[PDB]
Assembly symmetry: D6
Homo-oligomer: 169 residues x 12
């Protein structure tokens, strides 16, 4: 149930993230190349530490087991928008967590960071991750055509958004 908590990504967490980062089947849905030496990782972690344009979160339960990773990135502070990215680890999918976690990100985006808009990309051939975002109040503002090469072909993604005045009320 609602035992799930969001926390700041830490150095101790990089092995878990290193694993997700090299998983082809997971990183495809973030349109990120599945190749990352732990060293390269450690370093880009060191980079993200002094960077106000991102916030990375590790998602845990009460055993303190790593359940997943929410990211808010490209925070832009004139326009007050950021890009949202979510992964739940293989052994923690299916359990109905995504709503909770996706909503905590929004709570974060809108009640703390005081952003106007969250947006995201997802593959049009993820027709059910799409149902999800829509259930959480996201809607499609874009159908981006052949945006990303994923698994041997150019694919379509939807861009989806939610604003602060919607989520608040």
């Amino acid at each position: 149930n609602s035992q799930l908590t969001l926390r700041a990504l830490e150095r101790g967490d990089l092995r878990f993230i290193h694993n997700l980062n090299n998983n082809r089947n997971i990183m495809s849905y973030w349109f990120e190349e599945p190749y990352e030496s732990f060293d390269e990782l450690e370093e880009l972690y060191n980079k993200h530490i002094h960077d106000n344009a991102e916030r990375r979160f590790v998602v845990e339960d009460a055993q303190k087991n790593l359940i997943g990773l929410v990211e808010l990135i490209e925070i832009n502070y004139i326009h007050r928008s950021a890009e949202f990215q979510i992964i739940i680890a293989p052994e923690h999918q299916g359990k109905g967590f995504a709503r909770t976690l996706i909503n905590r990100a929004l709570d974060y985006s809108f009640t703390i960071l005081n952003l106007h808009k969250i947006y995201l990309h997802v593959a049009v051939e993820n027709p059910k991750a799409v149902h999800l975002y829509e259930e959480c109040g996201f809607v499609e503002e874009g159908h981006l055509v052949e945006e990303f090469f994923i698994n041997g072909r150019y694919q379509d993604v939807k861009r989806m958004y939610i604003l602060q005045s919607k989520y608040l009320n």
Copy 2:
């Protein structure tokens, strides 16, 4: 027209860019804040020197007028895409230059850089710029709702794109 040339942006060009970069009715169109020390610009230009992820171009004519600037930014070499942007210096607009300028950018994109997709963002409330793009072959693929805060209001823009296939088989 057939006399406009695109060349890599140089250090001797940074006063031209500074001015553009600090002008309110020009930066609005790129969604970029109109404020930049010549000292910030120069340093950014030196880190730009190092970036394979961008090509910033300056636009000249016959007798050396700097007419404008074209960029291909966020060039991604797996997905083979880049964002395109353009400026015609205030004193050079409304001469039918843009058309030729957008079309030099695509030919660069697609005949040298060998990209697959150029995309651009343009204000819904910039309907002249929208109609240019459409007449060069850009089609809308998204209606970004209230994406930018510009001149005191959150504003919608169109995402548009064109593919390498369509340009070469134009």
Copy 3:
């Protein structure tokens, strides 16, 4: 009047800045020690170019005479507040310039930086700075008791503020 504009602070402006920063009866109303090497200015200018939390502006008349300094400082992007501070050069005071430049500060804050609150500090013994701010919409939120030592004694300053919504719809 309609002539007047703010632009980014440049390196060739530092002589004019330095002049003002060693002026006692000027520096006194910014609560600032009137002591600064041209060299400490240059380093501190190099420091604060990159500093996203600040914007410094020189004002120019139609003939590009340096008229004053407008600054928006401590800009926080979560709370969307920043502190405003201005100086008009001694030889340009008493012209009716003040409201125009305050208005430009607020324009930039609210239509470009998309801020929610702008605040300032003004000495309780500088009435007619206090009174110009009033006529631009600033209201007192606090009386800071004995806040700064200036000219041999601890003096009281007003904290005053204006919101985005009020500015943009009055």
Copy 4:
């Protein structure tokens, strides 16, 4: 009671500071984003190591349990003024400890740092903390309108202060 020591924050207090710097409830009262990786904290500590403009104090009891933090920040040596802030650890709340930590930081400010004015900022929605300050001699000098965005709303804050002659006479 007199069983509370204040002392300089050391590297070994950082796990403790970190945990507090990621508690949203605690950090709310400080007008403060509840996100801080350990590495970022240790870089900030390494920095203020050399800021004569700031002092950070851990509170300890007799047995030397870590009760809290007290800070004097923005110390100004022309104007002789600094901002005071205090956290007590959730676990050590409500034992009538805070008045002692306050008179402690005041005594440091006035009897050692030879300061002239201490101010603080406290939520208008926290009339119990305001009460607290009033008992230790703090005088409201401002009511800042919508100064901070906290928890989805812009809120008001009391700025308050105390002077050296008042605390020492």
Copy 5:
């Protein structure tokens, strides 16, 4: 069989890479001096950590025995071309493993890196490796005369290649 994983080379694979980089017999087939102190390898690894122009893969089996190395080097993102090379460990030779490592690196090149052409260089004196490549779809495009000095004599090499449409159609 499908029991072979490819993954990014990590710091803990370096003793293994080192041992291979000092085997003259193995390194002969790579046109390559068989001398490399560990420190020099770790400096080279530290370097390519940040070369988007190269990818290095260790091969693992189910039990996660280190079978070999596969590399895509000189990746060019205008021309969309890279050089392929493969080592299998002496101890894991001759178990019909190489065809799988090859189709593996091809699939990475073509399905993830979205490359256009892969080439390799193979000894004209190694008609068994050439055979190997031919079965996985590689076409001889050059016969380089006396290209490399190996073992006291200047020898010829086949340059061969495969294209994306061919591997994916």
Copy 6:
């Protein structure tokens, strides 16, 4: 003719180099993007001075007009091979210069650097580069299928070579 000489590439030659490196219909036959800041040239020149694996040469006529560029690159000292690449400035082509400068490349490679093999890459759609190399002794060792994207398409290049012994005793 007998006038022509190669010498080390110098800093005061970079204007002439830069010119050539932003030339499209020149850069196309070196398989190289025609985009390069004067500043990226200068850094890359600073890079490659020390680089023992390369030698870059400017050619001069009897009057010290910059005639072209000769380069020997990837020089490996175990295998004793290097890649050769040349450019004659547009305003000096069609003079009969080509063989003299190829001959100088080979002279340097074989009598100074003591190389065993020199190879080049030439476009299969640049016949008369292919044919000049033949007359200097270069023979085809390979046909690289669809090797480079140039001018909107993947093109085939010839790999060609000449050995030390053949050069020095024919």
Copy 7:
């Protein structure tokens, strides 16, 4: 006199200071060895740039004569004290300048810097300088026995001071 001004020491002033710094009958009075490379002075000046613990001031008159130098050094912000020192260039002494100069230093000390105690060291054998100080309100608080080796002899000096209270209520 009423025309002498104190300003922060600048880089353009370091030849004036160099000369003073190398003059035997001027440095004796500060107990400082008369030997300094312009190169040492400049570097010290750059580290001085960074020091909140000091204010070095230059003394001008109406028509830009550099008359001297005033320092407040070892400024301590808990104990709120600083050492004061002064020089009048040889050619400007005996004009009754010192008096005004010592009194600009104290007013700076006590009206801006908000210090509590200025102190100074002066040679027992400099009884003119002693009498100046006493007439500005400095009183002796110590007789330092043989503190400095100056001109071949260990020598006594007077420590003198004045407090903020006494200056403001002068």
Copy 8:
């Protein structure tokens, strides 16, 4: 008895010094602020290592127990004077050591370092530490008025001196 020895301050000694440095009741008599992170300490130790203008000594007995700290600072080599500072740790006061230690400092100053004058400051409200220095041949050359803010008020210190020609003979 005269088992007490003076030695060079070392890195291993910094915990003992760290303790003395944060003791309000001890550092008041050196007019030094009682606040010092171990890190700041470590660093200023690293600084004092390449500094010919100071010598710091740890004072030990035969158990090798840390008994105290003598310092000679601002050694000035034209004028041949330095400032002397002494602390004996809390558990080692009362035992009559100060004379010994103060005299070893002088032996150091005058028989080794070849200084002409040692001077010191002490609070006029330390009327007995004053008797001490006087017993060791120090005399007052100054009564410095309101020099230091200590424990909530400006206080007077005496300056006291001894010369080489006196101590020798």
Copy 9:
């Protein structure tokens, strides 16, 4: 017998080399001063790592015991010559290894590195190390007169050479 192998000098090997480097009786025959701190060594090892003009080898047997050190230095790549240096450790002399090892160096020089000439220096009062080199196909091209001060006097060395075309065939 021919169990002896040549390998790249490594960091783990520096204690063994440190020993040989400080041995007066060994280093005399290399005309190198017998004085070298392990630190200086470590550093000049770090130097030789990014240096294409040398190759240093540790010579081992099958116990993996360190038997000796072959060096090829001043590799010059226009002229295709290098200087050869050999030491067998004290407890491994007399066993008849030198021929093997000297020949592996040549194999290295001529079959791998593709050099035209190997040369060496040896003291004329080493009349038997000279017989050796001559047995391995080296001949004297020089008798260098009073070249080196060794053990209290200027001494003569022979320079000796072998070329690639000789050794090959």
Copy 10:
């Protein structure tokens, strides 16, 4: 007897060197302040690591007890001259060891460093050390008046020397 080895000073001899560098009695004979933190010694060692103008030797016996230090400093390679100094450890004094350490450093200077003159400086108040030097062949060439301040008085020193031809003939 012949049971004394000289060798280069290593990092592990530093505790030993340090202890000697803080003995006032020992350091007196070297004209030398007896104060040196360990960190300062290790920085000085790290420095001279690269000074071809100096050589430092620990003395060891058979069992490898650390007997002392010997140094050749200020080696000048135009003039071929260096200064010699020797310490024996208090614990190893008076066993007729010093003559052997002296002829040892002379032999290094003359038979290895090919130097021309060695000099030393020895207290005029130490006629037993002077005796020592005279027996090993050192000739007084100066009587330096009040050259050093040691122990509260300015004292005289003998500068002495020996030449290469004299030591080797």
Copy 11:
């Protein structure tokens, strides 16, 4: 002749050296590749600044002609030996300068540097240079077989030397 002087090579001399360093029939004689950026030369000169193991000298006459260059390199201070090399600029040869120049080098070597043995390498096929050396007192000590690849052939050289004893007792 008695008017030739040797002085340390300076930064103002590096164009003279550059030219020499890039000339084929001059570098052959030193066995050194004829190719060097002025930028490489300058940097080498700055690391040369630091080297006790070398002395590079420039050769002037009466009226400031730069006639040449002399080096003593690989100076070894235990073995007390150095390699000597020499160049006379093309336009200054065949004037009987060399003799005096070789003999200034030895006197430096042996009267100041206090070396024991100077040695040199010279091409067997440079028999004029061989005869110079022999007439100054150099005698052969080795016949280095095919040591250098020069002008397309591996070539033999003579190692020659002279000792301090023989020069001073000349």
Copy 12:
């Protein structure tokens, strides 16, 4: 005479220094190799500014002609000794200058730096340097046998000295 003064060594003095430092028959009596780049001078000057253990002085006549160099080196602040070394420019020797400048060395050492002993080294084959030192109070404390190689041989030098007390009361 009374004209002559010593002042700190400055950067604009280095041409004059360099001149002297490459002079053989000058450098010989400082036991110093006459070889030094202007660039090694500049670095070594940058080195030794900060070096508290040395003071270098140029002497000037009444018209600011560089007359010579006076140095006090190895200044140790425990033992309070330093080594003295002087040069008068060749074109200013034989004027009777020597004692004045030695006297200035001692004045500075004893009345400013508060030294106890000043020593020098002088060649036993430079009598009249030996004799001028005598007349300034220097007495021999040692005869250094074969101390330096100079001009083809090992030569003997005198070590000579003068104490503070003797200088200051004779």
